[PDB]
């Protein structure tokens, strides 16, 4: 029993973290086989974060311009290339700790674990969602750049995020491991700001199922709803529209609990319209939206208290 | 910026997890140097969880009664002893992955990271507090026994918890690594239940400081309070009494923010008396009590937005 924001064990990612330094700038790099991945903004001059030309800033560098340290071992750089907003650094040593891995681009609503790192040294691990506005509500300080987000499945690490920058509202922006930003963001100082966000409706529903699995039914009701009538209400409260695809994804949870998806939607529509009336769900007064249906099946019992 | 429930990186603990099997019972063990630690209830017969005599159940076992597996390697047991509610199993191999470590007994209010494990295989990591009633609100399923709680300081792992059982309310009970239970709990099936809990007042205050550090002052007020007048209010709302010792601990945070502890106490007393008035603090409507002052200093900027 219980329900916690749960991250994946971080050991496999920890053995991949390194420090990358160019001139006076230091940040974190990711060392897989004989490549170190890092944010390209490591080569940005302090003089103008405003108008950097990365192609131009990069030709001015050689392999030995880059200092890479894994623990107390220096890694000799023997090649470099830019890929979108990342630098790909060839090194003289393959990481003996390279886990089985993949690079994946996650979609808004999906969750991942973040290993916060400073100076190549892991400091903490927490769970996050990719927000509909393509930011994450991370916890990151100066020098956290190059920290990565990931999921694990049967000892394969799926890397999905590398941290680049903090936005004025204190939320975070970054890229997949191909260096393509999530969202409309760019790796320079502009007036850019996080767009309006919405609540991840699918995740709220997953979490209501978790609460039922764990033994709580207080918020259910005798009603059903059509998908269309639900969306008219849900969108008034800044919830993402629910689609038949989202209804389908919730099939296994629905089957475990015996609660029809549209019946759970009616329950949610009532919670939105009436409030919580004091009362909590899995210890929470706010409707939680950073657990996916997959996260719920993974963490919860397969039985159902019931 | 940001503020997240943050666990310690789990890699060092992951390399210590093993599977321990006695007869039909399997659970997790902790392998440090040439010793494997596990819950003694591994030797409990399925026939009577009600009245087990562990001394009596243990003499009936030899070294080869215990199967220990680290990954796909079998560890030969070459000695065993009981220490309080744990079994200490001598094995033929020292764990080459043993980190620098200590065994500590934590106090109520203190926080730690939990590495949830099943069949010797780590599945997730989350942060918890030791509750005033000596339980933890974990997330644990059948077979999670022997999962450990820990903190890390300068590459030394301080082990503080080993998981033993779930209580009727779905909260969790266990021991320190000397095998002494936290709380009045015993490792057998009885009518035992978690005692009445209270809110960790010191942690709520730490978290209000975090919110100020991160740039938010909305809940502050022009008032101060005496420690005594605060406790009279606080205890009405099921908060632990604040002592001068707790006031002292909050010194560094107070100094970083320029807010007197008793002034923050007045702020909290107002939040308790008036409610939240909608409104959130660091994304939360409930006053959060599972971050210590040490957790705040560790995660937050040392500057102050402010
Ligand atoms: C507010 C802002 C000026 C944008 N700061 C950051 O983005 C922090 C930062 C701070 C906290 C968490 N993550 C990043 N930040 C950094 O911490 C940083 C840069 C290099 C090493 O650490 C940062 C990131 C990118 C830049 C650009 C792309 C403009 C060169 C500059 C600084
Ligand atoms: C509700 C209760 C019957 C007490 N179940 C548990 O404690 C679960 C358990 C379930 C979920 C999380 N943690 C423990 N539980 C177990 O999962 C367990 C026992 C052995 C391997 O896994 C358990 C723990 C202790 C016992 C005693 C001490 C009575 C022999 C029995 C079972």
From Swiss-Prot, chains A, B:
Name the active site residues. Answer: 41, 145
Q: Tell me what reaction this enzyme catalyses.
A: TSAVLQ-|-SGFRK-NH2 and SGVTFQ-|-GKFKK the two peptides corresponding to the two self-cleavage sites of the SARS 3C-like proteinase are the two most reactive peptide substrates. The enzyme exhibits a strong preference for substrates containing Gln at P1 position and Leu at P2 position
**Origin superkingdom:** Viruses
Q: What does this protein do?
A: Cleaves the C-terminus of replicase polyprotein at 11 sites. Recognizes substrates containing the core sequence [ILMVF]-Q-|-[SGACN]. Also able to bind an ADP-ribose-1''-phosphate (ADRP). May cleave host ATP6V1G1 thereby modifying host vacuoles intracellular pH.
Give all residue intervals belonging to the Peptidase C30 domain.
1-306
Fill in the subunit field for this protein: Exists as monomer and homodimer. Only the homodimer shows catalytic activity.
Query: What is this protein called in UniProt?
Result: 3C-like proteinase nsp5
Q: Where in the cell is it found?
A: Host cytoplasm; Host Golgi apparatus
* Residues exposed to the Cytoplasmic side: 1-306
First-to-last residue of the parent protein present = 3241 to 3546 of 4382
